[PDB]
């Protein structure tokens, strides 16, 4: 049967047939043109409070892998930056390429990074994630670019569990993972209003994209590329190039927290 994905017959250019909002006015990702983004001195520093984070499980969902968190309390939250109120971390995942020259969803002056990390948070004033994705300020996604260079020590625990979730539908216990080990040194950022980048493509996201990439080693991103989109017992299709390309910016402003 048919299902959305990243192949020739079901990739991003097809998604609008199943999810018409794919051609909407607030779609993500976008290219970040650094000479059009404006420094906004009213933006606050981003406040990342992850000290009490409780990771639970890691899941291969047939499109990427999600590291899931306990979001029943304000244990891992994002405040400040462009945001009003408190946004709770629910999961993170990545998008990556088949080659080091592509894989990111956002681009910076058309530059593609090897991968992009998305830490997904929902606005606590809406009570749960499902209600938050019915609201224009329901979600905040912290996006972090990955370039290939030196290894990221805080990523290695993720890399080493991937063999146990090779195929679609597999999950593994994944407790005591500290997402602070995935941050770069600087929290300077760009921000703009956008959407989820996979179906259902809902236009609920305040994007916060960090200026500084993290470095990961070639071996680390190689292990991402050994995952499978297919389920166990089906023919192997490598999980690579699970990124949506840049979408039209339309009426939107990208702001910078730094100059
Ligand atoms: O980030 C996405 O594209 C996404 C899609 C569906 C559900 C949760 C999500 O974070
Ligand atoms: Zn994503």
Residues 226, 54, 122, 210, CA torsion sign: negative
Residue 195 in contact with ligand 1 by CB distance below 6 A: no
Ligand 1 pocket member 144 (CB < 6 A): no
Q: Which runs of consecutive H residues, i.e. helices, occur in the chain?
A: 129-132, 156-161, 218-224
**SS3 sequence, 183-194?**
CCCCCCEEEEEE
Q: Which residues are annotated as a binding site?
A: 93, 95, 118, 197-198
| Ligand 1 proximity of 63 Cβ (cutoff 6 Å) | no
Task: Give CA–CA dist 24/201, Å, rounded.
Answer: 9
Distance CA 122, CA 131 (A): 9
Spatial distance between the Cα atoms of 53 and 97, rounded to a whole number of angstroms:
29
Indicate which CATH number applies to the domain containing 158: 3.10.200.10
Residue length, the chain? 259
56 burial level (CB within 10 Å; 0-12, 13-18, 19+): middle
Resolution value, angstrom units: 1.1
What radius of gyration, in Å, describes the C-alpha atoms of the chain? 17
Over the range 74-90, which residues count as b (16 or more CB within 10 Å of their CB) and which as e? ebbbbbbbbbeebbbbb
Name the residue of 24, 62, 69, 118 to mutate for ligand 1: max ligand atoms within 8 A of Cβ.
118
| CA 24 to each of CA 36, 198, 220, 251: distance values in angstroms, whole numbers, following the listed order | 22, 14, 35, 11
Cis peptide before 245 (omega within 30 of 0): no
CA of 259 to the centre of ligand 1 (A): 30
How many whole angstroms separate alpha carbon 86 and alpha carbon 98?
36
What does the DSSP assignment read for 56-68?
EEEEE-SSSEEEE
| Token output for 75 | 């244990």
Of 146, 124, 119, nearest in space to 55 by CA: 119
CA 100 from centre of chain: 18
Phi/psi of residue 233, nearest 5 degrees: 80, 0
What's the CA gap between 132 and 139, in Å, rounded? 7
Of 233, 244, 247, 227, residue with least CA distance to 61:
227
Residue 189: give the domain boundaries. 1-259
Across the chain, the runs of DSSP E, i.e. the strands, are 31-32, 38-39, 46-49, 55-60, 65-69, 77-80, 87-96, 107-108, 115-123, 139-148, 171-173, 189-194, 205-210, 214-216, 255-256
Omega within 30 of 0 (cis) for the link into 94: no
3 annotated active-site: no
Method: X-ray
Say if CB 220 and CB 159 are below 8 A apart.
yes
**Ligand 1 within 6 A of CB of 197:** yes
**Residues of the binding site for substrate:** 197-198
Tally of domains in the chain? 1
φ, ψ dihedrals at 132, nearest 5°: -60, -35
Rounded Cα gap, residues 175 and 114, in angstroms = 27
The torsion defined by the Cα of 193, 101, 111 and 158, in degrees rounded to 10, comes to: 40
Q: Which ligand is nearest to the CA of 144?
A: 2
Question: Which residue in 16, 63, 106, 121 is the catalytic one?
Answer: 63
Q: Among the atoms of ligand 1, which is closest to the Cα of residue 90?
A: 10
Q: Write out the DSSP string of 124-168.
A: GGGSSHHHHTTSTTSEEEEEEEEEESS--GGGHHHHHHGGGG-ST
DSSP β-bridge partners for residue 157: none
d(Cα 50, Cα 208) in Å, to the nearest integer?
16
Ligand nearest to the CA of 68: 1
Ligand nearest to the CA of 59: 1
Which pair of structure tokens corresponds to residue 258?
């730094």
**Does the beta carbon of 79 lie inside 6 Å of ligand 1?**
no
């Amino acid at each position: 049967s048919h299902h959305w994905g990243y192949g020739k017959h079901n990739g991003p250019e097809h998604w609008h047939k199943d999810f018409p909002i794919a051609k909407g006015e607030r779609q993500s990702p976008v290219d970040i043109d650094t000479h059009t983004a404006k420094y906004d001195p009213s933006l606050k520093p981003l406040s990342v409070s992850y000290d009490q984070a409780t990771s639970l499980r890691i899941l291969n969902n047939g499109h990427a892998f999600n590291v899931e968190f306990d979001d029943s309390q304000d244990k891992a939250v994002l405040k400040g930056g462009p945001l009003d109120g408190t946004y709770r971390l629910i999961q993170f995942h990545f998008h990556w390429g088949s080659l080091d020259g592509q894989g990111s969803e956002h681009t910076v002056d058309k530059k593609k990074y090897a991968a992009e990390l998305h830490l997904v948070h929902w606005n606590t004033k809406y009570g749960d994630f499902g209600k938050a994705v019915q609201q224009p300020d329901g979600l905040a996604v912290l996006g972090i670019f990955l370039k290939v260079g030196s290894a990221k020590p805080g990523l290695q625990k993720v890399v080493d569990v991937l063999d146990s979730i090779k195929t679609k539908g597999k999950s593994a216990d994944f407790t005591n993972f500290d997402p602070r080990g995935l941050l770069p040194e600087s929290l300077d950022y760009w921000t703009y209003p956008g959407s989820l980048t996979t179906p259902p493509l809902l236009e609920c996201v305040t994007w916060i994209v960090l200026k500084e990439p993290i470095s990961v080693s070639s071996e680390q991103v190689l292990k991402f590329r050994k995952l499978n989109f297919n389920g166990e017992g089906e023919p192997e299709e490598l999980m690579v190039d699970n990124w949506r390309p840049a979408q039209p910016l339309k009426n939107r402003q990208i702001k910078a927290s730094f100059k």
